[PDB]
Design a protein around this motif. Structure first.
Motif, PDB file in Angstrom:
ATOM      1  N   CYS A 170       0.781  -0.808  -0.047  1.00  0.00           N
ATOM      2  CA  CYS A 170       0.220   0.119   0.232  1.00  0.00           C
ATOM      3  C   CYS A 170       0.749   1.025  -0.128  1.00  0.00           C
ATOM      4  N   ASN A 230       1.431   3.176   2.750  1.00  0.00           N
ATOM      5  CA  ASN A 230       1.845   3.651   4.337  1.00  0.00           C
ATOM      6  C   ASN A 230       3.137   2.610   4.498  1.00  0.00           C
ATOM      7  N   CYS A 231       3.263   1.764   3.340  1.00  0.00           N
ATOM      8  CA  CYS A 231       4.312   0.552   4.006  1.00  0.00           C
ATOM      9  C   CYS A 231       6.129   0.617   3.130  1.00  0.00           C
ATOM     10  N   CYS A 250       4.942  -1.634   7.626  1.00  0.00           N
ATOM     11  CA  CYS A 250       3.956  -0.926   7.473  1.00  0.00           C
ATOM     12  C   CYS A 250       3.286  -0.588   8.976  1.00  0.00           C
ATOM     13  N   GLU A 298      -0.497  -1.755   8.785  1.00  0.00           N
ATOM     14  CA  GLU A 298      -1.536  -2.800   8.497  1.00  0.00           C
ATOM     15  C   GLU A 298      -0.704  -4.030   8.626  1.00  0.00           C
ATOM     16  N   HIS A 353       1.618  -6.642   6.597  1.00  0.00           N
ATOM     17  CA  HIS A 353       2.539  -5.893   5.436  1.00  0.00           C
ATOM     18  C   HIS A 353       3.425  -6.492   5.933  1.00  0.00           C
TER      19      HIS A 353
HETATM   20 ZN   LIG Z   1       1.017  -1.362   3.993  1.00  0.00          ZN
END
Ligand SMILES: [Zn+2]
Ligand SMILES: [Mg+2]
Ligand SMILES: [Mg+2]
Ligand SMILES: [Mg+2]
Ligand SMILES: [Mg+2]
Ligand SMILES: [Mg+2]
Ligand SMILES: [Mg+2]
Ligand SMILES: [Mg+2]
Ligand SMILES: [Mg+2]
Ligand SMILES: [Mg+2]
Ligand SMILES: [Mg+2]
Ligand SMILES: [Mg+2]
Ligand SMILES: [Mg+2]
Ligand SMILES: [Mg+2]
Ligand SMILES: [Mg+2]
Ligand SMILES: [Mg+2]
Ligand SMILES: [Mg+2]
Ligand SMILES: [Mg+2]
Ligand SMILES: [Mg+2]
Ligand SMILES: [Mg+2]
Ligand SMILES: [Mg+2]
Ligand SMILES: [Mg+2]
Ligand SMILES: [Mg+2]
Ligand SMILES: [Mg+2]
Ligand SMILES: [Mg+2]
Ligand SMILES: [Mg+2]
Lengths: 176, 38, 125, 136, 134, 94
Positions: B11, B13-14, B27, B30, B33
RNA sequence: UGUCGGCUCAUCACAUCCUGGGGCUGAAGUAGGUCCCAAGGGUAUGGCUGUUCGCCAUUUAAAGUGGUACGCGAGCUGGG
RNA sequence: GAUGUUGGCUUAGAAGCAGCCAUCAUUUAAAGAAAGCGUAAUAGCUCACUGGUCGAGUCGGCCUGCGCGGAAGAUGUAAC
């Protein structure tokens, strides 16, 4: 880099002793000492501190930037000090302060007690909340985290030791 | 911790990192991840 | 984004309504909803007033187009300008009652005759 | 799954794969998948791939397949000694030399095409790249 | 501070009105029958938007505004339901006089400068549900 | 307008060409017209970024060779098989 | 250069069956799934079959997978 | 981070955010008939986008040089 070139203003009554790579900063909130990495060169001018690399090193600017953040926080420490806030979520979670030892009733069998290292003082304005003051950022942060270590706040009801500011996300039970 | 030889951003935010000569994907969002190379 | 050509044309439009305008009022636009702002845009097209929020270093280039150059220190902070192309006043009487109605932002410095008017004396207009 | 309708002979010499490719350029579509490395493409590979990039375009634009698996490979089964003839015909392959153009494509947005070709190349044994048809 | 779209002389079913603004502290029957007393004048079958304003003491003041662009375009083209496939399948028609009537109703309800701006926003809602302007 | 700088080739053959290509330079030719052919070398990069436009192929360009321009068109060009590269260019006198 | 299996004795690996540490979970707890780290020790008695294997019975924290001339007949057996 | 507006379709409900189709226009410095969490449906939370502060370089492809992960086995290091 963009860090190392913003110099640190040393406010009045804030004492800077530079011996070689060894800094000692003193003030009203106490005393601190740090040996800098050898790649860095730090100079005292007016009242301000400026950091630049030294020749013979590749990484001089990363080392510098770090030096800057370090001594900047070392300044903030012996002037204003530092505060960390934790709170305990869930039933029958208590916190007491006796001298430098913290009493945690966290719902284990035995009482859980946390010795605080020197330079750190603590107080509980409630049963459910602890606050630590100290000069040293790294140290108070650590101590805080060790308290968080005992019971880490959890996925469902949020129970545990959390930082007062800290965002906690839960999830629902797997349905059935 | 998905442990594998191809690690990616799943995503926005990773964030990729090399810690101690390992490439991991971290992350905030999540937990699913969270990856390590291996 | 905005190309240099974009900025150039826009400086020409602000300089062009500035030449044509009788009086202006610079103000802070911060901390107000687009609902109350479209409300002062209706109360703007009704009073003949030309409303704008324009870049600062753009408005130094447009206001170098004279005689509003006394306003170039009023451009530090977010800038919302009210040019009354029809009538002088009706910007300066509308803004004080909008900023007292909202109790947000500021309404800092005006300009008329070629001179700047300080914040408590904009009651002249 | 591609395979010659009818042939002159049933079997073939292993042959070599040497030198470079012909048809280095994109003559039909706007884009093409070119092969950088050298290897044999079974029909299975080509089919799976064509599928991949057919899902990817949601059946829009157009897809050419420039390569054909015309040379038969044989295998003796397990537990069989050497000799006693040449093995039975297992499957078909296309010899690929560096710089052939495996698939062509057009009628699609470029970004999407680079994508579809990445997904197509996941199914291929050999090193590949993306390319655009040029004037001259 | 809530909003709903309620049919003309109607109120107090359970799924559309009562719970929605009833979890907010609002007395339900005063809204219901002062809204049917205000909107008794709106034609039967048109949803009319109502903006409910609640205060810390639960005494509310609501501005009932003019029926939607989509509802006055359902009625001015004669139709019932607009298109399920807008501008692909087109379901009705309005001459510029109905664009301008709906945009006088919404001249009371728009942000527009001129009745051409409100006629153009009703033009936009005329292209949204599929209707043709003729 | 495109202006390509070039030098006259003192050598020929496969060896010369591959030393050329190793040095980040490449061989091309200028023929057509009453004159004799002129073999020349070019900078791979300049031209590679220049034919990165379309007009290069439809237009009259100039080539600066030993102080002297010639005006030419792009005739055909052979590219390396998989690489973003140019093996050679046929220039026809304009 | 003695061929299967049992017996006696082992010993190494780790791709771990248990016990130890841990991440993620469609992880409420109990009990799990999957992956990571770990070889210190532990790792069933019988019925049938020459059996390895298997099937079944009843266990246990678990009844690991492999290497060793498919370990081991100048140690035993001889059913195959 | 605006109005029309809960766009229409559909649904007990779809309100930017089940699903289908359009995706216009207004006030605009800017504001997708909305990039995600969210609701019975809302509300609620960021994003795209723009004004402010800041103050000089920043973005990501292409081509190559050398390295990293991918990479587990049995007596003893034992793959200079
Ligand atoms: Zn993520
Ligand atoms: Mg470590
Ligand atoms: Mg031959
Ligand atoms: Mg040939
Ligand atoms: Mg010769
Ligand atoms: Mg040779
Ligand atoms: Mg292991
Ligand atoms: Mg465990
Ligand atoms: Mg459960
Ligand atoms: Mg586990
Ligand atoms: Mg063991
Ligand atoms: Mg030990
Ligand atoms: Mg027995
Ligand atoms: Mg048994
Ligand atoms: Mg018996
Ligand atoms: Mg027996
Ligand atoms: Mg044996
Ligand atoms: Mg064995
Ligand atoms: Mg034996
Ligand atoms: Mg022996
Ligand atoms: Mg016998
Ligand atoms: Mg640059
Ligand atoms: Mg390696
Ligand atoms: Mg391993
Ligand atoms: Mg070993
Ligand atoms: Mg040596």
């Amino acid at each position: 880099s963009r860090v190392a070139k913003a110099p640190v203003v040393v406010p009045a009554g804030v004492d800077v002793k530079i011996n070689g790579q060894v800094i000692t900063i003193k003030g009203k909130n106490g005393e601190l000492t740090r040996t800098l990495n050898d790649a860095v060169e730090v100079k005292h001018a007016d009242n301000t501190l400026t950091f630049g690399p030294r020749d013979g090193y590749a990484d001089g600017w990363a080392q510098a930037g770090t030096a800057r953040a370090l001594l900047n926080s070392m300044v903030i420490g012996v002037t204003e000090g530092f505060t960390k806030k934790l709170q305990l979520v869930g039933v029958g979670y208590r916190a007491a302060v006796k001298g430098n030892v913290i009493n945690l009733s966290l719902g284990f069998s035995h009482p859980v007690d946390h010795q605080l290292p020197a330079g750190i003082t603590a107080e509980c304005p409630t049963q459910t909340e602890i606050v630590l003051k100290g000069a040293d950022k790294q140290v108070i942060g650590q101590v805080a985290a060790d308290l968080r270590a005992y019971r880490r706040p959890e996925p469902y009801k949020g129970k545990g030791v959390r930082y007062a500011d800290e965002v906690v996300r839960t999830k629902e039970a797997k349905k059935k | 911790m998905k442990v594998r030889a191809s690690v990616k951003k799943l995503c926005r935010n990773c964030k990729i990192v090399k810690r101690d000569g390992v490439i991991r994907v971290i992350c905030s969002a999540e937990p699913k991840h969270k990856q390590r190379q291996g | 984004a905005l190309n240099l050509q974009d900025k150039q044309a826009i400086v020409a439009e602000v300089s062009e309504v500035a030449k044509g305008a009788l009086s202006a009022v610079v103000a802070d636009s911060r901390g107000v909803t687009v609902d109350k702002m479209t409300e002062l845009r209706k109360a703007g097209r009704e009073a003949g007033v030309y409303m704008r929020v324009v870049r600062n270093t753009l408005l130094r280039r447009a206001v170098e187009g004279t005689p509003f150059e006394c306003l170039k220190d009023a451009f530090v902070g977010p800038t919302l300008i009210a040019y009354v192309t029809e009538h002088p006043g009706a910007a300066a009487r509308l803004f004080k009652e909008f900023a007292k109605a909202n109790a947000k932002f500021e309404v800092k410095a005006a300009a008329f005759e070629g001179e700047l008017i300080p914040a408590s004396q904009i009651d002249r207009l | 799954m591609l395979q010659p309708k009818r042939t002159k002979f049933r079997k073939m010499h292993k042959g070599r794969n040497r030198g470079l490719a012909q048809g280095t350029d994109v003559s039909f579509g706007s884009f093409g998948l070119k092969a950088v490395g050298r290897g044999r493409l079974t029909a299975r590979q080509i089919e799976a791939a064509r599928r991949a990039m057919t899902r990817a375009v949601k059946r829009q634009g157009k897809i050419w397949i420039r390569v054909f698996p015309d040379k038969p490979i044989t295998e003796k089964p397990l537990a069989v000694r050497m000799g006693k003839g040449k093995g039975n015909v297992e499957y078909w392959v296309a010899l690929i030399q560096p710089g052939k153009v495996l698939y062509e494509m057009d009628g699609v947005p470029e970004e999407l095409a680079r994508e579809a070709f990445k997904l197509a190349a996941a199914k291929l044994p050999i090193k590949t790249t993306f390319v655009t048809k040029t004037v001259m | 501070y809530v909003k709903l779209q309620v049919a003309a002389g109607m109120a107090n079913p359970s799924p559309p009105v009562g719970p929605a603004l009833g979890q907010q502290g609002v007395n339900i029957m005063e809204f219901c029958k002062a809204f049917n007393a205000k909107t008794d004048s709106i034609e039967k079958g048109l949803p009319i938007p109502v903006v409910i304003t609640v205060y810390a003491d639960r005494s509310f003041t609501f501005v009932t505004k003019t029926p939607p662009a989509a509802v006055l375009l359902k009625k001015a083209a004669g139709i019932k339901s607009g298109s399920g496939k807008p501008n692909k399948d087109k379901v009705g028609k309005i001459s510029r006089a109905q664009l301008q009537e709906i945009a006088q109703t919404k001249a009371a309800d728009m942000t527009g400068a001129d009745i051409e701006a409100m006629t153009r926003s009703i033009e936009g809602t005329a292209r949204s549900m599929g209707l043709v302007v003729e | 307008m495109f202006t390509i700088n070039a030098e006259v080739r003192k050598e020929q053959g496969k060896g010369a060409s591959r030393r050329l290509r190793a040095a980040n330079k490449f061989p091309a030719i200028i023929y057509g017209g009453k004159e004799a052919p002129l073999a020349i070398e070019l900078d791979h990069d300049k031209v590679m970024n220049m034919q990165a436009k379309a007009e290069f192929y439809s237009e009259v360009l100039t080539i600066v060779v030993d102080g002297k321009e010639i005006k030419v068109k792009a005739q055909d060009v052979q590219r390396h098989p998989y690489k973003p590269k140019l093996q050679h260019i046929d220039f026809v006198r304009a």
